Amino acid sequence: WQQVVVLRAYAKYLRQAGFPYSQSHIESVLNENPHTTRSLIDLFEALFDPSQETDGRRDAQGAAAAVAADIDALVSLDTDRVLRAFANLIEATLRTNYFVARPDSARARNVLAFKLNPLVIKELPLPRPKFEIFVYSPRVEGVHLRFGFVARGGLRWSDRREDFRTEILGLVKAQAVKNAVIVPVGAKGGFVVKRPPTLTGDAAADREATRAEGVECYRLFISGLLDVTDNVDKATGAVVTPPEVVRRDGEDAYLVVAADKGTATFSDIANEVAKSYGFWLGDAFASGGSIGYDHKAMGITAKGAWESVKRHFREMGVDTQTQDFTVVGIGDMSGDVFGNGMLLSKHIRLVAAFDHRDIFLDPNPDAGRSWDERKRLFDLPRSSWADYDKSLISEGGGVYSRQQKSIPISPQVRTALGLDADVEELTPPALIKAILKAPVDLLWNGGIGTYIKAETEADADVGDRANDQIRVCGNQVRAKVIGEGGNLGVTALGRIEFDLAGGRINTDALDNSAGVDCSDHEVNIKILIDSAVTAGKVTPEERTELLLSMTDEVGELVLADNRDQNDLMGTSRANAASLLSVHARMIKDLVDNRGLNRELEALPSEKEIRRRADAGIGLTSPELATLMAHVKLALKDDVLASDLPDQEVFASRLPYYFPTRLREELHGEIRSHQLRREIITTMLVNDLVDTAGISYAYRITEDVGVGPVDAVRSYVAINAIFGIGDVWRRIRAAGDAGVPTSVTDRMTLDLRRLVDRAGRWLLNYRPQPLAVGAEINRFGAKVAALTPRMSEWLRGDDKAIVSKEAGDFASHGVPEDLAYHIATGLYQYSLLDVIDIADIVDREPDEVADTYFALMDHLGADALLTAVSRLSRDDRWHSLARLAIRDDIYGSLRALCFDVLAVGEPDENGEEKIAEWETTNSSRVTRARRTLTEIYKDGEQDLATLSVAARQIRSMTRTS
Amino acid sequence: AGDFASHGVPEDLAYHIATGLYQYSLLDVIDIADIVDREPDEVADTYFALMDHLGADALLTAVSRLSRDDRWHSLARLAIRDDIYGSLRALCFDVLAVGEPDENGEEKIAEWETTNSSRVTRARRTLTEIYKDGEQDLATLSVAARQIRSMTRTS
């Protein structure tokens, strides 16, 4: 009967996979072929019986040949397909718990677990996860999908026992995007009970049976998960395989369970089960529950969404910390998101805020009194809007109940809500709909469900009946800024329509990621301290004290990460219109190679892209966030396959992930972290995308023609040489002082132009692969020495345009030193060629830079470079051509620098060197200079004129 | 030559006419032989063999198809033409810098391609993809011109 259970579980998995024939057809086929079923049973048993490993070589060829020689003899198409599916399932099986016999395991409790490789199963619909775990039992049935070795995700207590794997596979994509900024990879699991709770007709007894039966099934599902999962033992530091378990894949020990719609209160139960199994993660197996961080006291999710709200308001020119603004909210002063988000600013004027029970209306709210009352309400352990003080409410406003038939409308409420002038009373449904469509500065979301829909989206496809009566249209919402503190507040198409309606909006996974990030960081810390617990460095009863001590620093680190991502999104929004073609090329590349689905990820189609191109508009902000997340995931996958995290020059920033206390006290444990490579990869990709931009690596791939690994090397070299991170931080700090977002965005765009050109220079002028440490140590010191003295050698038009740009920057509040440093970025790029030239001519870089920039002013190369920058980039080939002519000009000036410094004496300045070089030229050089002069006089700046000018500069050099 | 002779043109005159664009390259061949103080026979052999190796004839024909409606486009098209010719001159210097005179053009090209680098490999792949694309505007020909240029160290 046990082997029958194995076959039954495989058949149930096939039904979950969407196999056409039903269970009755499957069992009929198996019954009509008992010899074949015997062959498959022998195959599975011999593969996974540990005793077979003690019986010499396993009967691999014999079992495989017997099965094949029986399958090919079949004549029935349905029988052949069914038995082939089972044969492939047996071949794809990696681990099982059929032979473990320890009493505490789930096997003794009649639970069967299978670890499967979905990549080699024919009947599985796309996408195919990296690892799958199928747990079958007569009481509970669950699945778990993972896309990588280090994975994280929640567990649904689903009720769709007929086909729940489709629901899990649908949610795994959104979960994968949700984990773009955090270390692990998106994963998703889900279990369902098979016998429903006892139907007795009494609500008190029914709801008790649902919870009671759910815990026992939840315990069993996790127990099956831990049977096949490996364990990490710090007695030796290696990964141990559970006994009586025969593996066919490699090693896999990471497994983290997150709360979800049916697991929010099951965290402590999961941790207790992990303790029973003796799992290495311990209390980190589940997020929070009873040991961890008070997310209510932290409010990290509300702060994370408030960063996006503040960025949008700064883009509007409004400071939420010093200017009063009106807010419509969803929720009450009792939840984590809404409660912490409504107390972050004393200038908040909550005009209206509905909930699941009652509605709060304030036509002309105050600031200090409103903040005080909101704080007082948040002080209670539990409260609603009915507890709001009716003495502090404005005239005409108040608190009403959602269960009333109708609510009278005051003229003040109507004036503060922007409704039809003839209304005098309204119903709670229409009141909520009118609140959702209001001329209000901020729309704070802290509730559950979807309240905003797209115009073309169907009500049933949303998947929320409770809000089906109150769902509104995205293009109809009148709010300027929408902050999504909760999950799934607005659909992706609704986000696209809202951003196309002029409103500012980002993806929810970009706003509320802080709560996930703080969940990841704590886990990433809980492991490290646990290591120090085994080493004796951490006293066991001081461990919890240490976590409670580092809570604020953890929140600060997560907030810094969210600030970085928000700043990158703002800059990308500023440069969204001019990079539409490159974005479309990136989408096509990801679709062709990484198997991205445009409709599933809400990315625009080719027709939509060309329609926007004819309309002169780039991608929407949520679309940009989605593409940025996918690029981050692809870069993570590329780096993990490489050895960059292994090398020290990239691993030098590992301690910065952890708080300062751990940074000082724990050094060897940090250097010997279990998830070190993944943390390094996440940090590198986050820094690269945040600083260089979304399209940095892809443009490198098209232009240079190398893999993303070399792009990462180039960005690291440039960041260490020029200090791009410090400049970006200074720009952000200046923007925080009162500088408008336009000036800061332009500064970041110029800096990104600098890093693009410089990285291309390293990829084109240095041996491949790039020795990052070598080029850093041979360029960075000289660049840092020559950068401050830039004013010593700029002449003529170069000095004039730099002074103009620096003055324009400083006129908006930018510091003069930062403004001048920004205006010289294109000239700081030339210092790389200056250092290379000085290395070749074994001379000091001061004279080399002097003569180089003097010669640049002599030929007026700045005007030609600016004209080259104006060249069209509508297709790829024109882009390659314009970078070609740019690099040709730069190389020509390099050769001219060789020619000029080949004569003269070092004490001579740039002007004298140019004079004596022009003295000994020929009619060829005279004709070339006259041609450039006539070209400048003509004023034509098409490709042909710039090209002939490029050879004129080339012809000035003998080596050409 | 066959098309010319099909109308009554003598075969010798027809072949001499059809080789005019290649008789032009003999000036560069003689200059190269003068620089490398070698016989012009081997120089011409390797030069035209390298021309067939890179398919410079197709690029020159495409350059000849460029528009001449104004003066500047004419200067640009003569610029790209002379750039291609000078690049093949430099490649001839590089190829004849190694090997032995008894080796023919094919062997010299083979041993030159043997000791190249990833830069030259990328350039040749780029020209191959350019030929596969079939686009013959100014931009594509210009980037192809640097690909041929990038095959040379002195560039």
Numbering used by the authors:
A (entry chain B): 629 to 1588
B (entry chain C): 1434 to 1588
Reproduce passages from the article.
Glutamate dehydrogenases (GDHs) are ubiquitous oligomeric enzymes that catalyze the reversible oxidative deamination of l-glutamate to 2-oxoglutarate, at the crossroad between the Krebs cycle and ammonium assimilation. Large glutamate dehydrogenases composed of 180 kDa subunits (L-GDHs180) contain long N- and C-terminal segments flanking the catalytic core. Here we show that the mycobacterial L-GDH180 (mL-GDH180) adopts a quaternary structure that is radically different from that of related low molecular weight enzymes. Intersubunit contacts in mL-GDH180 involve a C-terminal domain that we propose as a new fold and a flexible N-terminal segment comprising ACT-like and PAS-type domains that could act as metabolic sensors for allosteric regulation.
Cryo-EM and SAXS data uncovered the intrinsic flexibility of native mL-GDH180. In contrast, 2D averages for side views of mL-GDH180 tetramers revealed a high degree of flexibility at distal ends, where ACT*1-2 and PAS domains reside, and their corresponding densities vanished in 3D cryo-EM maps. A 3D-classification of the detected mL-GDH180 particles was performed to distinguish alternate conformers of the enzyme. Two mL-GDH180 conformers were found, called the open and closed conformations, for which the ACT*3 module, the HM3, the catalytic domain and the C-terminal region were defined in each monomer, achieving an estimated 3.59 Å resolution for this region in the open conformation. The two conformers differ in the relative positions of the centers of mass of the subunits. The catalytic domains in mL-GDH180 monomers in contact through their N-terminal segments are found closer to each other in the less stable closed conformation compared to the open form. A comparison of the mL-GDH180 conformers identified by cryo-EM shows that conformational changes in the N-terminal region correlate with alterations in the relative positions of the catalytic domains. The catalytic domains in the mL-GDH180 complex were not found to contribute intersubunit contacts. Instead, the N- and C-terminal regions of mL-GDH180 provide dimer-like interactions between pairs of monomers.
